[PDB]
Write a protein that binds this ligand. Structure first.
Ligand code: AC2
Ligand code: AC2
Lengths: 112, 110
């Protein structure tokens, strides 16, 4: 497995998964459960930490950059769809700041 | 530091020249662009011109802190604009390059 995907699993996902703001992102947006009949109109590429976490457990990723894009798509989905004033937006912002400051310490290069 | 230099000369380099970069090279001008609610909604304006100047003037103490400014700039765009505005596509494209360039950053400190 890659040095960088190992960092993404054990440092980034470990931090973000147990975070007190993580729960709205731990599973796919369920448009029916949440009452969002336009969600899949607006968000064409849904993403969530459950999917990323399993994808790290199943070595589905080839490069770290593609794990990073899933994280980024997840947060971007949230800012695009939700209202500027929704608490979910500031939860995503808080989680994204951690993702970014962890990524600033990720190795370079590749392995495996 | 080595990482700030990389963010200056590799990351900011690539993004500045990009064909979608022009809305992001200078602060949003809410009055010229016709957006009287822009500052009611975005409380932390940010833009690559401000980030470039801060890197030239040694404003940043750490890499993560310049990376946060890049993120704020993109997030502002996503939060303020309608999902279908082209500028959202432009920010996503730029942000993807940003993440990919950041993954190859020297891991140290300097
Ligand atoms: N579904 C749901 N779970 C929550 C809420 N607050 C905390 N949790 C549990 O997740 C926190 C991590 O254990 C909440 O408001 N709703
Ligand atoms: N109430 C609540 N909002 C959520 C949840 N998951 C997603 N959202 C709404 O944000 C969608 C952004 O892509 C969740 O389980 N709790």
């Amino acid at each position: 497995v890659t040095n960088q995907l190992q960092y993404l699993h054990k440092v980034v996902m470990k931090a973000l998964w147990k975070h007190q703001f993580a729960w709205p992102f731990r599973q796919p947006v369920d448009a029916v459960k949440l009452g969002l009949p336009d969600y899949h109109k607006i968000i064409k590429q849904p993403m969530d930490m459950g999917t990323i976490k399993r994808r790290l457990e199943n070595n589905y990723y080839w490069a770290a950059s593609e794990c990073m894009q899933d994280f980024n798509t997840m947060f971007t989905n949230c800012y695009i769809y939700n209202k500027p004033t929704d608490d979910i937006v500031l939860m995503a912002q808080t989680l994204e700041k951690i993702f970014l400051q962890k990524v600033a310490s990720m190795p370079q290069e590749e392995q495996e």
